[PDB]
Design an enzyme around this catalytic site. Structure first.
Site, PDB file in Angstrom:
ATOM      1  N   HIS B  42       0.881  -1.401  -0.025  1.00 18.04           N
ATOM      2  CA  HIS B  42       0.109   0.017   0.016  1.00 18.04           C
ATOM      3  C   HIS B  42       0.990   1.440   0.018  1.00 18.04           C
ATOM      4  O   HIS B  42       0.473   2.277  -0.359  1.00 18.04           O
ATOM      5  CB  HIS B  42      -1.102  -0.019   1.194  1.00 18.04           C
ATOM      6  CG  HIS B  42      -0.370   0.019   2.467  1.00 18.04           C
ATOM      7  ND1 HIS B  42      -0.190  -0.903   3.276  1.00 18.04           N
ATOM      8  CD2 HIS B  42       0.123   1.252   3.070  1.00 18.04           C
ATOM      9  CE1 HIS B  42       0.636  -0.398   4.336  1.00 18.04           C
ATOM     10  NE2 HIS B  42       0.616   1.018   4.302  1.00 18.04           N
ATOM     11  N   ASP B 104      -0.173  -7.717   1.995  1.00 15.87           N
ATOM     12  CA  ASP B 104       0.517  -6.410   1.881  1.00 15.87           C
ATOM     13  C   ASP B 104       1.818  -6.173   1.937  1.00 15.87           C
ATOM     14  O   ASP B 104       2.578  -5.785   2.603  1.00 15.87           O
ATOM     15  CB  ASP B 104      -0.063  -5.688   3.124  1.00 15.87           C
ATOM     16  CG  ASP B 104       0.010  -3.810   2.942  1.00 15.87           C
ATOM     17  OD1 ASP B 104       0.516  -3.703   1.930  1.00 15.87           O
ATOM     18  OD2 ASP B 104      -0.604  -3.412   3.897  1.00 15.87           O
ATOM     19  N   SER B 198       4.725   2.387   7.930  1.00 12.91           N
ATOM     20  CA  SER B 198       4.496   1.441   6.598  1.00 12.91           C
ATOM     21  C   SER B 198       5.635   0.684   5.967  1.00 12.91           C
ATOM     22  O   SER B 198       6.401   1.828   5.585  1.00 12.91           O
ATOM     23  CB  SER B 198       3.381   1.940   5.866  1.00 12.91           C
ATOM     24  OG  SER B 198       2.147   1.944   6.152  1.00 12.91           O
TER      25      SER B 198
END
Lengths: 148, 251, 34
Positions: B42, B104, B198
């Site tokens: 992402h 992810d 992230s």
């Protein structure tokens, strides 16, 4: 049957066929060299060299000499270093080199023998890989510093 | 990084920063092999339109529009340990789901391989799965408690939660937690990753191997360090096959 | 800080989902500038 020709003095590191007690007119021989050597006739390296005997009983050419097979310079290894098994840096027949892999950030694949010796075909060789060079890989997860 | 401790200069050499040509950071990364960076998928795409929850080439962030920084310590200030690197390609997981957060994880091809030194060098891919309660370390330049930003890299040392008791926690709030996901954190909350983390790695020390392994990357979580809600990370062993397929990296 | 307890919405640059109650939402942890 014809005229006789001087008994031939064989080359160093090299055969002669056919071997005969005496040599006469019209006879012809082949000069070869051992595995790992070629025949040098100024200035070229051939596998065999031929001479006949003439009517006048003399040989058509002088005996050439065997020059050793020399595979030149080992190929460079990225993040790697070459070391020789002799101080004089031998690159001729049957001489060995060890490809080392720069410390401490790199290591070698499959932790292979890493040794390269010269084949009689004039080529740096490894009985695991062949002519293919080793591969030097990054060293994972080994930090130089630990916490306080 | 909520309630974190400042990372010590050189104890996390695999850490990578994903920042715009601008210089401003937006994700974390971890160096794999000679010229590859692993991250959360992402990180690498502009927010897909809800009217069409599918993916497109046009949606993916372009290689020309971001850079990788290795050997960074200070969040904004620069070093001679920093190495600024281009991006050849970026590859997301084929079964990556932007809405579910499944798989992810994504890989970024470096344009030129970095010079390996004491401050820059890769992390190991996991050669096997993780036990319940294993102490991991999570690192990032993310937002901390009280919503400010650090001057330095910050880390937290936290236990991994068992998948079963993690799922039980995220139901009946009706959020799916797949095998490709892993949870780290303590029951009463307090230490977590956050905004700007992230892709940042989650590592373990193995003994008697004496080597650090990559376990997973920062994925998602409710808020930050909330009671009874552990932070979710991308499980890597689950996608190791793909990674090895794409990169060609052996340990 | 409430939300529609449906399925998918975008909290700034990050993608989000709301629980059975509209109070809490699970989001990705990227940094925005928008």
């Amino acid at each position: 049957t014809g005229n006789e020709c001087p008994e031939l003095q064989p080359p160093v590191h090299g055969k002669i066929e056919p071997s005969q007690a005496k040599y006469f007119f019209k006879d012809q021989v082949l000069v070869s060299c051992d595995t790992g050597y070629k025949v040098l006739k100024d200035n070229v390296e051939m596998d065999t060299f031929q001479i006949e005997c003439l009517k006048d009983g003399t040989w058509s050419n002088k005996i050439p000499t065997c020059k050793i097979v020399d595979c030149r310079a080992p190929g460079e290894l990225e993040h790697g270093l070459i070391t020789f098994s002799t101080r004089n840096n031998l690159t001729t027949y049957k001489s060995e080199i060890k490809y080392s892999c720069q410390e401490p950030y790199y290591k070698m694949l499959n932790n292979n023998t890493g040794i390269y010796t010269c084949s009689a075909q004039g080529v740096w060789m490894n009985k695991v890989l062949g002519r293919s060079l080793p591969t030097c890989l990054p060293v994972c997860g080994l930090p130089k510093f630990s916490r306080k | 990084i909520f309630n974190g401790r400042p990372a010590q200069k050189g104890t996390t050499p695999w850490i990578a920063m994903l920042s715009h040509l601008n210089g401003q950071p937006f994700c974390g990364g971890s160096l794999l092999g000679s010229s590859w960076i692993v991250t959360a998928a992402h990180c690498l795409h502009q927010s897909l339109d809800p009217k069409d929850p599918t993916l497109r080439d046009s949606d993916l962030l372009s290689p020309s529009d971001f850079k990788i920084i290795l050997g960074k310590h200070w969040r904004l200030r620069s070093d001679e340990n920093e190495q600024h690197l281009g991006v050849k390609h970026t590859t997301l997981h084929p079964q990556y789901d932007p809405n579910t957060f499944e798989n992810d994880v994504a890989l970024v091809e470096l344009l030129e391989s970095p010079v390996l030194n004491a401050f820059v060098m890769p992390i190991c891919l996991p050669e096997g799965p993780q036990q319940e309660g294993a102490m991991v370390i999570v690192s990032g330049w993310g937002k901390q408690f009280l919503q400010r930003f650090p001057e330095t890299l910050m880390e937290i040392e936290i236990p991994i939660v068992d998948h079963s008791t993690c799922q039980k926690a995220y139901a009946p709030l009706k959020k799916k937690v797949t095998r490709d996901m892993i949870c780290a954190g303590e029951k009463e909350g307090g230490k977590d990753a956050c905004a700007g983390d992230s892709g940042g790695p989650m590592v373990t020390l193995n003994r008697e191997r004496g080597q650090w392994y990559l376990v997973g990357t920062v994925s998602w979580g409710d808020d930050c360090g909330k009671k009874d809600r552990y932070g979710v990370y991308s499980y890597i062993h689950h996608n190791k096959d793909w990674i090895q397929r794409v990169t060609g990296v052996r340990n | 800080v409430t939300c529609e307890p449906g399925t998918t919405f975008k909290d700034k640059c990050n993608t989000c989902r709301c629980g059975s109650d509209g109070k809490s939402a699970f989001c990705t942890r990227k940094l925005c500038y928008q």
